[PDB]
C-alpha cells in the first residue's frame, strides 16, 4: 500500500461491505451502495444521508434486508434520526 517513504502504491481503496466487511471488487455488479436520507424536526429531507454498501455475496444470500435493518437501527440512534 504505502512505500517505505510513505507514498501510496495502490490504484484505489475498494469499499468494504457494511455488513460482512468484505472487499467489493470492480466486477461485483451485484453490490449496491444505498443512501438513507436525514430528516429535520418537521420531517423534511435536509440533504444529509448515511451511506451503506452491500456486497453481492450478502445480497445473493437474501440477508441484505436484515443486515440493512440492523445497521439503520443503530446508526439512526447515533445521528439523532428517529
Amino acid at each position: 500500500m504505502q512505500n517505505d517513504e510513505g507514498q501510496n502504491m495502490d490504484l484505489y481503496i475498494p469499499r468494504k461491505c457494511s455488513a460482512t466487511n468484505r472487499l467489493i471488487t470492480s466486477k461485483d455488479h451485484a453490490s449496491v451502495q444505498l443512501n438513507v436520507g436525514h430528516l429535520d424536526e418537521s420531517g423534511v429531507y435536509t440533504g444529509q444521508f448515511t451511506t451503506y454498501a452491500l456486497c453481492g455475496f450478502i445480497r445473493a444470500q437474501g440477508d441484505a434486508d436484515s443486515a440493512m435493518d440492523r445497521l439503520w437501527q443503530k446508526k439512526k440512534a447515533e445521528v439523532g434520526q428517529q
Partner: protein
C-alpha cells in the same frame, strides 16, 4: 383523541387487511411476522411495516432525479397503483411484462439504467430483480410472509396480494415521499383519495 401519523396509517392498513399474510412464512420473513393463529395464517406486525415504509421513503427522497426510480408490477392488481405512485412522486412506471435485456442490452430501444427499483412482489417480479443484480441497482419490494428475499435490499412486510392492500401501501408510500420533500403538509391526511390506487376491473 387525536391519532398520531403512525396510528392513523396502521388503522388504515388494518382496514385493507395489510396484516394478513400467507399460510407459509419464509425463514427471512419470520423477523417481521408477529404470531400465527390456529387458522395457520401469519399476521404481519404492522408496527414494523410502518417503520420499513419510513426507511424506504428516506431512500426515495435521497434520489436527486425521481426519473431514475422505476416502479413496476406484474400482477394486474398492482398495475394501477404503480401508475398513480409514479404520477405523484415523479417516478417512472412500467406496468405489464418486463422485457428481458432492459437493464443489460444497451442497443435495444427500451434500455434503461435506474438508480432505484421498486417492485410489488419479488416472487412475480423475479425477472427484474434477477436482472437488477447485474447493474448495481438497489431494489425495494413489498414482501409477503412467503416472499423470497434474494437480491432485496429493503423488504416491506405487507400483504402484496389483495387489491386494497397494494393500493394502500403505495398510497402511504407516495404520501411519505411527498411529505419528506415538503411538497405537502405533514400528518396522516392527503388531499388525494386512496381509491385512485385500487384496481379498476373492466
Amino acid at each position: 383523541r387525536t391519532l398520531s401519523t403512525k396510528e392513523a396509517d396502521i388503522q388504515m392498513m388494518l382496514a385493507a387487511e395489510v396484516h394478513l399474510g400467507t399460510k407459509n412464512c419464509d425463514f427471512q420473513m419470520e423477523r417481521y411476522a408477529f404470531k400465527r393463529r390456529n387458522d395457520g395464517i401469519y399476521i404481519i406486525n404492522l408496527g414494523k411495516t410502518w417503520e420499513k415504509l419510513q426507511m424506504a421513503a428516506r431512500v426515495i427522497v435521497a434520489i436527486e432525479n425521481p426519473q431514475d426510480i422505476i416502479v413496476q408490477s406484474a400482477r394486474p392488481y398492482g398495475q394501477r397503483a404503480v401508475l398513480k405512485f409514479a404520477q405523484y412522486t415523479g417516478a417512472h412506471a412500467i406496468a405489464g411484462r418486463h422485457t428481458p435485456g432492459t437493464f443489460t442490452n444497451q442497443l435495444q430501444t427500451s434500455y434503461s439504467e435506474p438508480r432505484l427499483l421498486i417492485l410489488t412482489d419479488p416472487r412475480t417480479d423475479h425477472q427484474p430483480i434477477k436482472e437488477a443484480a447485474l447493474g448495481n441497482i438497489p431494489t425495494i419490494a413489498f414482501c409477503d410472509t412467503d416472499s423470497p428475499m434474494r437480491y432485496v435490499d429493503i423488504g416491506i412486510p405487507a400483504n402484496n396480494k389483495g387489491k386494497h392492500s397494494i393500493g394502500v401501501l403505495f398510497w402511504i408510500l407516495a404520501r411519505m415521499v411527498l411529505q419528506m420533500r415538503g411538497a405537502i403538509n405533514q400528518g396522516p391526511k392527503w388531499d388525494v383519495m386512496v381509491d385512485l390506487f385500487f384496481y379498476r376491473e373492466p
